[PDB]
Amino acid sequence: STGSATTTPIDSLDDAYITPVQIGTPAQTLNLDFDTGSSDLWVFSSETTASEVDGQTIYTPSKSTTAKLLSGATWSISYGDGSSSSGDVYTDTVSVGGLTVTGQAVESAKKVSSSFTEDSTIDGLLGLAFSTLNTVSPTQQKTFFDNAKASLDSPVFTADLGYHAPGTYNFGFIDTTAYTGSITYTAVSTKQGFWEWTSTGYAVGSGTFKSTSIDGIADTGTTLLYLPATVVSAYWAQVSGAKSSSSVGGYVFPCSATLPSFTFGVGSARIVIPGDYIDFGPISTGSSSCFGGIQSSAGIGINIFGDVALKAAFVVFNGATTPTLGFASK
Numbered sequence: 001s002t003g004s005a006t007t008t009p010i011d012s013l014d015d016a017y018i019t020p021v022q023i024g025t026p027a028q029t030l031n032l033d034f035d036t037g038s039s040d041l042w043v044f045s046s047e048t049t050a051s052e053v054d055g056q057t058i059y060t061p062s063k064s065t066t067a068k069l070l071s072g073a074t075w076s077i078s079y080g081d082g083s084s085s086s087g088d089v090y091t092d093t094v095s096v097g098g099l100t101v102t103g104q105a106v107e108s109a110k111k112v113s114s115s116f117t118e119d120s121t122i123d124g125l126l127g128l129a130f131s132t133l134n135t136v137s138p139t140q141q142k143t144f145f146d147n148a149k150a151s152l153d154s155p156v157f158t159a160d161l162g163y164h165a166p167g168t169y170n171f172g173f174i175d176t177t178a179y180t181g182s183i184t185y186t187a188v189s190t191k192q193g194f195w196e197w198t199s200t201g202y203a204v205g206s207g208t209f210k211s212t213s214i215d216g217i218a219d220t221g222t223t224l225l226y227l228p229a230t231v232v233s234a235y236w237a238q239v240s241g242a243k244s245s246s247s248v249g250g251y252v253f254p255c256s257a258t259l260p261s262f263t264f265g266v267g268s269a270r271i272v273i274p275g276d277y278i279d280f281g282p283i284s285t286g287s288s289s290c291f292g293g294i295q296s297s298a299g300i301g302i303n304i305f306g307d308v309a310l311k312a313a314f315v316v317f318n319g320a321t322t323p324t325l326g327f328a329s330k
């Protein structure tokens, strides 16, 4: 089997991407944030504290003929941005892009933090990191990908995120029409439960490539590119008037600037992030200070190849017995 679903930016900045997901019988379609940095499929629901729901579509298990309470199971998750959610668990039928899993754990939120409530466009998360990170207690649950894997034509999914445009998540196949050149594969460590890999270095604009190992994670659920402070300083030093602002929470730059590209290495291959991808617009409405898309990972404890980086590539998440990542230009 295979699946193929379009993923759509939630706003004009590509802050996140939503993908429609069918849950239950008859189908209830919710727009979920596919997150390769976490391992819980959780949804706004008929159980979510009413004051914490503001515009989201909710899953109502009582209206699904295939829903079953997973008795005694609870979940609670905290993300890198400080957001959180928790609740109880149902099993139900879940379909993505025509690919169906029966018996998927659907984590029903009883509580969500303010950042979730305030984002009316995201109805929940669908985690695609390794199932070792799933938070369900006392019986850990599998991700949608891990439950689908054995049925897929190939044990893979691909992320093809758009720049200010829709893109695609495919399950079970490589679309050889979706990228240019060849795919360069690189080793993955699953030790922390992430799609963790080592970039071979970077370049700023037309500058020389610096060969250096940068361990980080491929995380579709993180907007920005978070790299070591040395690398990030070298990038923003090429932008007149850029500075790190403790008041704003990162590097800002004059909105009048033209940003340089950023290149990262994948083995001997190179992925180029256009300068435009690194502009996250005014820090507040009408400001002439703009927020940068490359930020320091210092204090986060890991480097994160978030959407800024991933949307410059066609990315293969290879879940074979030895997992690997692949990157191609597009």
Ligand code: NA
Binding pocket: none
């Ligand atoms: Na922000």
